[PDB]
Design a protein around this nucleic acid. Sequence first.
RNA 1: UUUUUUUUU
Lengths: 50, 797, 558
Amino acid sequence: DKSFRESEKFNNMMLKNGTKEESENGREIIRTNFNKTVYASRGTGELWSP
Amino acid sequence: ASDNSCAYCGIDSAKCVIKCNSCKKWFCNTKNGTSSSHIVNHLVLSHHNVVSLHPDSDLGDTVLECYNCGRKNVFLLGFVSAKSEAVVVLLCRIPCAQTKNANWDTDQWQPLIEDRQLLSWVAEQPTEEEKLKARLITPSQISKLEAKWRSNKDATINDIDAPEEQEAIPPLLLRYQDAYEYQRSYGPLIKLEADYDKQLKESQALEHISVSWSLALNNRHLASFTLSTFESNELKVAIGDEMILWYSGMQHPDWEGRGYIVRLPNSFQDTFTLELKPSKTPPPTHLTTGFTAEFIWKGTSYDRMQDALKKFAIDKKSISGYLYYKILGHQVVDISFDVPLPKEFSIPNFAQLNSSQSNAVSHVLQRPLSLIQGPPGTGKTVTSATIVYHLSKIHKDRILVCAPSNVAVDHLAAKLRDLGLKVVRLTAKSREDVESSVSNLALHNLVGRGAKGELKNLLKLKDEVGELSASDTKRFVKLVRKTEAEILNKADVVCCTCVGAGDKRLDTKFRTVLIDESTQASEPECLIPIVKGAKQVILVGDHQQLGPVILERKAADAGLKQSLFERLISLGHVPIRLEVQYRMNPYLSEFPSNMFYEGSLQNGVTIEQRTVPNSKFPWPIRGIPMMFWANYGREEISANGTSFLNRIEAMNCERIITKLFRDGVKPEQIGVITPYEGQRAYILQYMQMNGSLDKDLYIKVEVASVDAFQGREKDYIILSCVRANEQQAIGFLRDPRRLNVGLTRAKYGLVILGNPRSLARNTLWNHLLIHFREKGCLVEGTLDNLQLCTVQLVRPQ
Amino acid sequence: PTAFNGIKSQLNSILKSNQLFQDYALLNGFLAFVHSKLNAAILTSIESQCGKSFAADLDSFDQSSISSILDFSWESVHYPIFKWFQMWRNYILFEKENKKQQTKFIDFRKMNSKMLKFFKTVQNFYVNVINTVYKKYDISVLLPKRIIQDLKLSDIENTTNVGDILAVKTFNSSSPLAHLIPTLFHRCLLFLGTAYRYKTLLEEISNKYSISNFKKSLDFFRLASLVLPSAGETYSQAGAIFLQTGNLGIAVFNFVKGMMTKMPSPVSIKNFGALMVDNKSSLNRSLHTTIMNTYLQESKGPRTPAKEILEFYFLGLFGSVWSPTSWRDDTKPNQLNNGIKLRHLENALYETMSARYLNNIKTIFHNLIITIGGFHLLLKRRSDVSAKTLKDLRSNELDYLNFAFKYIAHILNDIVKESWSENPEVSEILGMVRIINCWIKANPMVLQYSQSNLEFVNALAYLINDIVKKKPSPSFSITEHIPKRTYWFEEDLMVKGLSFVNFQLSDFDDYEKILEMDHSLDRLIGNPPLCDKLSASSEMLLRLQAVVNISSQLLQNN
RNA sequence: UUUUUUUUU
């Protein structure tokens, strides 16, 4: 799916742009700066009307 | 078929048909195919209240009216057996049947409606061949055919047969493919809700009202008009609503006057006060009758969140990628933040945090979203204040705090001001004239006080005259917009309602947002402030208390009652619970914690702290402030037409009130809560009439419904089950949430009244009965001479 | 009762309703309610009694309120609930139908669960009463410390204020509270012990019970009787306990001790009459069955059955002499209704106790106590004018006197004469002679009858001669000075409060002397401080001095 | 076989 592709690309680039860590629960956790942000891709689609 | 025949089954017998006064139709009294008689069915479905008997019937062509006062609402009247034999006197339920009079004993007074059916002597039952000859009709067709009398008055069973479109609205989804699907799924429900709220409010035109004129402190004319108690109680009006007060007649030409409400009917006055906006046309202060008030419906509540959905579905820079892909519910690897943790979580000169709230504060500063679930009395307010203050100190940015309730926003703003941060309160334009405890934090107050130069002269001219020139008005709006922008840019935190985030004045995108008691609001109401460019959203709320009241019934069925907090928890988010309570006695605490909280909740207060010494109240077990006083009365119908009330529970509650008063408890420590509104009303006038001691000492007691008493606490609270019917039907109390929100209101002592037999069928009330009985609290009889009640509570398998 | 009557009827309805078979929670809450209000009433009664000053008249002190409250609590709530329990086990255990025993087993399991719950509740009620009265008030001066530790009151920390420390002496009858707390503790121990014995009956599936199962109840009844000796109702309960386990001589001693107390127990009289007057009573047939079972075992058994011969053959002699009509055959008055000859049975006793006195002396001592109480309960039996001199005695009581003095002279000649010197540790050997002489001196008419009896007089003279000749102590001699002790012996306690010694053994003139010096209450119950605990040898010499003095005083006018 | 409350340019 196009949404799935956007999700995978966003996750991969988030993995690339951050530093790796291990949390208290054991889930792999990425530490990233507050001042740097990523906006997810939108695409196009049809919009419902009143 | 004769005109006298029933409109539902067509029975021609005049000993069973009865004429409705409002719609001029005849109705039978049988229960064929329905749980109730048809006449009351039509009365409640069409709001009708007045009925007239057949001329040929045993009583004759008469209209059922009250003897003493003359009311015509059939739901009130009832027969009283006069002391003289074979004499029947018509009296309404109140105050005629309760004001003692020597000409008849009122203790045998019975409602004209029993078991949802009129009395046989007033209207006899049809004979069996007459029943078999009448056409059968199920309640489904009853409601369907009733639905179209409001449009055409000639509809019959074969007339309509209408396949009106009833499009199956798509049920809400958990994980949407994109923002477009989310918007498409949500839209229709919101359209229906807006349309029907507008429909209901616009139908409340108040006509031929007697208006009394007066001058307020700000030189604004006050239009104070009195209304009937039934209409005023049915009026769902808040302080600050806007309507049109227009008069049309010979005495004075057509006029239109708009303004807000600054006072509402209460226990002291039943006067609606209308502060009129200053207008070029002066109000006719010489007029007192003939005025008509029409409420100005406003779709701004819905259009704003429509704009919010537009922003979510269109703008890329509306929401950060992580919170976007979490709101859509898509799988995303967990993300942390590079923020230095504070040395000590607790703040000096303020509340000291325990381990649980320390965990809550610690785990919240590192993640972009999390959910905090707070049992009542724990004090979520201090946790929210600490989180806001520490995040603001960490990032030094503008912070947004929102909550569906205006009083809750006021409380959080006062608390945040107690921390020394800079707090600005965004008051609604209609609410700008409404006083509050944080009125000094009002943004309008801020611009008015911090006005300088031309701005003072413009504000003074606007206040003195009321209206300005077009050029002056444009300078004024531009300059106040400039000042507001400076204030907001200078302000550390911004206070606005969850619906106030749709205002255009909040043009600036906000990054740090606190949403408080999110469950109390629906999902769009919490999505309003989240699409304004935020990267860290923190949601506070508890999903075991009352949430959103959705008037639309298809919307509530489809899922509009499911708040964002509930959806996120259902997604897989595990909240952080605070496991200590500081309000109610451990005996008062053992049940709700065990049933709703899995027993994990712990008591932060001791038994002695929640124990009043030398208490002379006859509790069944000394040391256990909880009892179940069983009453075997029968429930009735109030003047509304859909509520219920019980007189036996009213007298018993008044007795308990007096008994607690002789124990020394002040009225401010005792309140009464009733799950039904008409019961609350009856309790109110019964207390104000039959007060054994001074009536003032009773009127100071606050009485309100369960839903209107959410988020508050009292030393003593009395619970009334009311429901007492032969069919053992309880109604809307089947949800455990309503029971949960009710018990925790009381700090020291809890008193429960009602009929244990009706409640015994419900499993939840069955376990409440088990817990009350096993602790030696299930009693019966007079409070002075309480013995245990031995009704069989366990159903024999 | 004007306030407690409804709950008595309320409890009655619940048993009749049979709702407790399904809903035990009803019973539990009902019990909580009654426990709450009875505790409140007890507390109000005690606080009302405490508020009165010492100057108030003794007649204005209502001592019986709490006693009535607690008797109502047992006999009207606890005992009826136990009775319902008992009928319930009776129904399920004795269900004559052919239903599977597994269902009865699960019902039995439900019995144990619920009755452990109920007994735990009742024991909590009583123990809470005890602990509360120990907490708000000081009881050290009035109760022995042994009762305090045996009730585990020592671990209960005392929260009484210094100003709340009541200054009441050991035996100041002016202070009302010197009696209500003793009665309260005595009846609490009474009802706790009844709870334990009843629970023991409950837990055992079969109807066969052994002495080893009622140990705790026996202990609690022991402290109960120690708390208040002047309550024959305590002794009757222990008598029943020994009744159902088949120990009968100790049982009859218990019932007699119960009825001739200062306050007589009607149930003890009824029980004794059932064993002794009502021939139709099943307990009398139990006695008859076991007595000729003992005869069969003596005749055919491989060994001489010493213990139960000594006990039940003695019971047979006591019957045949005390109530001649119901046991001796109308055709043959010389044999029991079971056909057992009286002379053979009596000689069997003589040989048996002369041979095995040392292993069963306690049973013989109980035989002595029953024998001496028999004459008093016989002259109490008189519906005519009570006897005052020997002339008014009828033939039956003269025969009883002859047999009793025969027994006394025999065993004084055969047991004390040979075993006093060899066995200093056996205090009963000399305490028995002390009892014999104290009883002969407390009643003038037996004393006058004794001087006419050659056997008893010569036996006493022989015993005096042997004691003098053996010369137990160098300074031992016949002196008129009454020996004094610092406490009371075991015979004083076990014969305390009984009228045939005028409720106290007066062979020592030290009661006031014991009272004036410390630990008097503890020393009165034979538990002095370890410093004053003399050796059993010194005890035997003091008993010897008292015995020889009183015996010489008796034989001066023989 | 359901009647209660929140919000509002």
